[PDB]
């Protein structure tokens, strides 16, 4: 995030880090229950990767993190890599998260909900802070 | 230009698909939504994470970090997967697996 700010630790308890086996972070995602994560289809997650929940500071071990394993990957079959359209993927976890003070779920909307142009919303992540 | 060790957050406004088209034209599809153009931006490494708005008080998944400008320009809006247009697919999938 360019021009954002540090979060209060533990205040976005659905934010997860997706990592390879060496521990390199490549994408984010969101918990929606004890067994399922929502992410983007372009990230190319497979069953080799790890789901890391409950983490704040990637450079320090003053956290109680959960490393979760992926049972299967459901890519949207309308996903088009030329238009980057229908960019959604679901991850079913082979080991359930246990919900706590720093780990739990975001709400999903109804198809019918209306979020009006000009509403203030919020984004989170561990991406570049400058080009 | 490296990664922040600690989790970042930023506030930003939603656009209409009509205004977003003034920057991005025909790349904007029905399963997309834009936010930003307000002095902040998502950037490489944020892909697949959340954009959330309040509904009935609760934080609710409106977008998924998808794509945008190759220099992360804080003048240009960012593009996100529109969860409302994809949520019935989510439901089918959970239900059957």
């Amino acid at each position: 995030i360019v021009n954002g700010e540090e979060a209060v630790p533990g205040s976005w308890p659905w934010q997860v880090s997706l990592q390879d086996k060496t521990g390199f972070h490549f994408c984010g995602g969101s918990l929606i229950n004890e067994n399922w994560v929502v992410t983007a289809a372009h990230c190319g997650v497979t069953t080799s990767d790890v789901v890391v929940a409950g983490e704040f500071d990637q450079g320090s071990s003053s956290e109680k993190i959960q490393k979760l394993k992926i049972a299967k990957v459901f890519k949207n079959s309308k996903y088009n890599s030329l238009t980057i359209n229908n960019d959604i993927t679901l991850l079913k976890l082979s080991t359930a998260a246990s919900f706590s003070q720093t780990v739990s779920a975001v709400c999903l909307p109804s198809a019918s909900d209306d979020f009006a142009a000009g509403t203030t919303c919020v984004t989170t992540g561990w991406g570049l802070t400058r080009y | 230009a490296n990664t922040p060790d600690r989790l970042q957050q930023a506030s930003l406004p939603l656009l209409s698909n009509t205004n977003c088209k003034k920057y991005w034209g025909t790349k904007i599809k029905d399963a997309m939504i834009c936010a930003g153009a307000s002095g902040v931006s998502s950037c490489m490494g944020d892909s697949g994470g959340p954009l959330v708005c309040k509904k009935n008080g609760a934080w609710t998944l409106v977008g998924i970090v998808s794509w945008g400008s190759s220099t992360c320009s804080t003048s240009t809006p960012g593009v996100y997967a529109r969860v409302t247009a994809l949520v019935n697919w989510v439901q089918q999938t959970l239900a059957a697996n």
Binding site: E5, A7, V8, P9, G10, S11, W12, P13, I32, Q101, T102, S104, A105, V106, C107, L108, T120, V122 | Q9, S11, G57, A58, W59, T60
Partner: peptide, 13 residues
Amino acid sequence: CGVPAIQPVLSGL
């Protein structure tokens, strides 16, 4: 869903 045990704080909100 959607209500953290630890309330977020944001600049200007």
